[PDB]
Amino acid sequence: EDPPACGSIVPRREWRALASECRERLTRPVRYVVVSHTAGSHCDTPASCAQQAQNVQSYHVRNLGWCDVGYNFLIGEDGLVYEGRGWNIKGAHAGPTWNPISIGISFMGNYMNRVPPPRALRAAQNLLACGVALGALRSNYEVKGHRDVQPTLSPGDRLYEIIQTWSHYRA
Amino acid sequence: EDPPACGSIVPRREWRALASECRERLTRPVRYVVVSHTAGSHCDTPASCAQQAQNVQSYHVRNLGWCDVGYNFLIGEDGLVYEGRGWNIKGAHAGPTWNPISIGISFMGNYMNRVPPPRALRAAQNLLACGVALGALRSNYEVKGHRDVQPTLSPGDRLYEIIQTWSHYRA
Amino acid sequence: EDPPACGSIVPRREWRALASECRERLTRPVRYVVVSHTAGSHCDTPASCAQQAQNVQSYHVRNLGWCDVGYNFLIGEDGLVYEGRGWNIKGAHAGPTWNPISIGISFMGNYMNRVPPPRALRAAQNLLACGVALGALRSNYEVKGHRDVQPTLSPGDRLYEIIQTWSHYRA
Amino acid sequence: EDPPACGSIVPRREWRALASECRERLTRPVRYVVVSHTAGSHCDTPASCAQQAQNVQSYHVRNLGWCDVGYNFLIGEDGLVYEGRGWNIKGAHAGPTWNPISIGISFMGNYMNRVPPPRALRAAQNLLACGVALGALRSNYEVKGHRDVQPTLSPGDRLYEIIQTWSHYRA
Ligand SMILES: CCCCCCCCCCC[C@@H](O)CC(=O)N[C@H]1[C@@H](OP(=O)(O)O)O[C@H](CO)[C@@H](O)[C@@H]1OC(=O)C[C@H](O)CCCCCCCCCCC
Ligand SMILES: CCCCCCCCCCCCCCCCCC(=O)O
């Protein structure tokens, strides 16, 4: 017994998460969400999306020396939310101006020339309220595309377009 | 001016469903939630879970003459909640004493010999979070096993064995 | 058992109860009878007692969100009995240990410093005979005060006192 | 280690409690607190209140076969808090729906006509604050009175009135 919710977020264990070593808390109620893409391989079943999830925490951790997988949360084309660092700690996903005062969610794959399936987007907007319900995120929050806060092609052109049409999106 | 949610549900159009013809509604808010299985094939891709969702609906409609898939909400082994008749329409899931006063949710496949995947209980349990949040269910909704209200083994031995734990189970 | 029997209860429809939404059944014959009080106002007329019956249900179903008023029967001081959940359905009046195995009759008044009138008693003793006559209660049924199975002053010092003299009373 | 944090509760041994036999746990952090009153005599000295604590346990354990005194904590009008089942152990003060998910504090007395003193009221707040600094209560915990969740006059008009003015109060 540790989680009885929330937007049916996969807890660290089901995807084989090596224990975070991160120790900088984020300051709930955060004001920003940054959307990004892993520019990684994509996955469409919960068995490709767990393996691919534990693939990026390991690059971040085996190779980059990081305390934990960079993104606050992760999202696959299979269509569920993967717990990363969470609401509480600070992520490493948008450089030093934003990392502290935002939450980062990353879609799992490259989105320059493909978009993700609706469930993927549905899984995200959900984490959204179930995270405002928690008070991690302000009622009135601003959403930003990775490339809006850092010079990168993240989250891909096709995934970018979509998030521009989100009500909480704000350049 | 207070509620804003709730859930990640594969909508009818998304599983390529046939249109309902059903017109009887339930008085909101519903107090019971009866659980069940399909005793059909199971699926672990979203892809073949939109298929099973469909076959289940097909049987129910084309063979039993029904006005829809009989269940308010279904569940796939891809760890997703599949919409059927939804929160407002009456189901054909548990006979004429219980159908009019409850919401019936049914897992897909046959569950005498497989306890179902863990995400699923999260997905389903989270779906009940919605009903409440929407005022589809009573905050104090009561969860019944199918076997509790019909003379049945269903939702499957393994699985039943599970639901007895929930925080809202009276029998 | 061919020609019976009893009948002194005022039916729901007659005191204009709201629809009971309960579905949990007692196994009959029922061994134990639990005597409680409403801890509110007494009534002395069918009219008053029809309302008083009304309020209690309102408190149980309106406020507390229940399926029906708790008791199986309520005794008014106007000398008549009020069909609560009756003989075949689980009361909610003495906790999960006793509700499956008892009917709960509860006097509608406050009996800490008042004796309920002889008619109310007559009514109550008379109601039990009825239950026996029907196989609703075991012929050797055990009566118990509310305070005896639960922490409360129900059914009152002056009343508790009386039912401790009842032929069917048990420590 | 070394931060604070909480106490000023009279422990079990001190008020000479019978050794508890209760197995069943609670899951922290608990969200709900239900305010009850013992509906008995009040005590205003460490001497008598320790007396009370025991009478009440006796009632529940020697007279009802309960594994432990029903409450998690009691408050005396001596201004002290009496350790009951505590933060970690499911108590028996409000039915099988509130018991597993809440914390039942009982004021030792009867506040239908009487009001509690300042130091009783302060002890209780302090005790909830305590619960929070320890992660036994949820920082945004809800307080409910005993007549909000079960049919009863507990915890006394004048005191019900007061707890409704509490910041954590929720009808
Ligand atoms: C450990 C014993 C406590 C001792 C206290 C003494 C006071 C007793 C007064 C009358 C007794 C009555 O409470 C006993 C009872 O029958 N309780 C619950 C239950 O018994 P079952 O035998 O298991 O069917 O049957 C009911 C099911 O029909 C069940 O629900 C009842 O009590 C509950 O705990 C349920 C809650 O009270 C339901 C209301 C809360 C749900 C949310 C709405 C409230 C508003 C708050 C916002 C969320
Ligand atoms: C209101 C019912 C109480 C818990 C049932 C909610 C079902 C799980 C869905 C979670 C979304 C809303 C948050 C619920 C709180 C439980 C989880 C938590 O607080 O960490």
Author numbering:
A (entry chain B), B (entry chain A), C (entry chain C), D (entry chain D): 1 to 171
Please quote the paper that reports this structure.
The 19 kDa peptidoglycan recognition protein (PGRP-S) is one of the four mammalian PGRPs which were originally classified according to their molecular weights as PGRP-S (M.W., 20–25 kDa), PGRP-Iα and PGRP-Iβ (M.W., 40–45 kDa) and PGRP-L (M.W. up to 90 kDa). The significant concentration of PGRP-S has so far been reported in the mammary secretions of camel (Camelus dromedarius) only. As part of the innate immune system, mammary PGRP-S contributes to the protection of animal udder as well as to the new borns against the invading microbes. It recognizes various pathogen-associated molecular patterns (PAMPs) with high affinity.
The A–B and C–D interfaces involve two opposite faces of a monomer leading to the formation of the linear chain with alternating A–B and C–D contacts. The previous studies have shown that LPS, LTA and PGN bind to CPGRP-S at Site-1 which is situated at the C–D contact while mycolic acid and other fatty acids were held at Site-2 at the A–B contact. Having obtained these results, it was pertinent to determine whether CPGRP-S could bind to the components of multiple bacterial cell wall molecules simultaneously through its two independent binding sites or it would bind to only one kind of PAMPs at a time. Therefore, the binding studies of CPGRP-S with LPS and SA were carried out in the presence of each other which showed that LPS and SA bound to CPGRP-S with similar affinities as those reported in the bimolecular interactions. In order to reveal the mode of binding of two different types of cell wall molecules simultaneously, a ternary complex of CPGRP-S with LPS and SA was crystallized. The structure determination of the complex showed that LPS and SA were observed bound to Site-1 and Site-2 respectively. This indicated the binding potential of CPGRP-S to interact with two independent PAMPs through its two separate binding sites, S-1 and S-2.
